Amino acid sequence: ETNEITIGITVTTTGPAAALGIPERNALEFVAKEIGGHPLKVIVLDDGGDPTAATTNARRFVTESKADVIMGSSVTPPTVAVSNVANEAQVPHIALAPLPITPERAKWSVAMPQPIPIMGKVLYEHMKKNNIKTVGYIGYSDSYGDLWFNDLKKQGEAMGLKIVAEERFARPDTSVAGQVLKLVAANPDAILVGASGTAAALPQTSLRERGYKGLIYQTHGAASMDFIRIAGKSAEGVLMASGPVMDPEGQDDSALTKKPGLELNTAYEAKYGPNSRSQFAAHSFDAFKVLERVVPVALKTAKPGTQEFREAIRKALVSEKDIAASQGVYSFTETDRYGLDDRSRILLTVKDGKYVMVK
Ligand SMILES: O=C(O)/C=C/c1ccc(O)cc1
Ligand SMILES: [Cl-]
């Protein structure tokens, strides 16, 4: 057993997904340094978004650092890898990307990002309030893109959407020209883009450049000012699912998410400048808010640096209810590994080069 509580974090600070991981790493400056008087020993590694590196990193944490908790990664593929390692090694894992948490992954993994169906629902609800009958999809040719397309199909169709076109692209692709020509030809009333970070801006710019006039909808993987920096004028009028951390100012004081959002954004934006808030910084910040709640519970009955403590953290994640954080109010169960509800999302648009919450 140790005095310190050991937390390993693998995030993507190089490569195309660096725009997600950099804020996640930077937010660590503003989290707890100590819980219950026990210093937190936080070990941070880059995985480059590569599942192999993330597997290596997670394993370094669980065996070499004897971590009590592991966190990461920034995008879905390395996040699945971390979950594989955490469930084998029996170490609690807080995911920072929204992976499919299957029965094989559920025991030791929970997720900070909003689950795809919560975010889909708020987008499709807007679609059906704004005369959208036909919808096209463009998203990744991998698990994240699949989760979004499957949700559009299942949930979206049931709400009165007809899917008239489906196109995919790979994360590293620098053009989506062919896919966009087909989408523009199909001319759906709206298009849903299933992507994240820099790649989310690519269909935004390509669609507007290549003549698309309909509404464009973006996932919560796009929610940072970076999207507007890259897409520019093509971002105008976009509808975007976001966590509430993007606008704590617009929340009522009664919102449990308001205080922790104001705390993170004030700290982050003091160092990195106005409107540098992000969806992503909030996930690592919120993971520590969760630790603030569950670690004192585990400390009652178990010593840090032991399996008993790992197990106590696992049990506490589902005994401790209504954990307030900047992105939502979490109540995990044995079967619900996201634990979120409507308090975890707002809808954004872009007007005059800035985000505005849609009332
Ligand atoms: O690129 C992915 O696989 C998805 C990234 C993502 C990260 C944080 C979110 O809150 C949503 C999506
Ligand atoms: Cl709380």
Automatic annotation (TrEMBL):
GO-annotated biological processes: amino acid transport
Keywords associated with the record: Amino-acid transport, Signal, Transport
Protein's name according to its UniProt entry: ABC transporter substrate-binding protein
Similarity field: Belongs to the leucine-binding protein family.
Domain Leucine-binding protein: 4-319
Keyword Signal carried by entry: yes
Keyword check for Transport: yes
CDD domains: PBP1_ABC_RPA1789-like
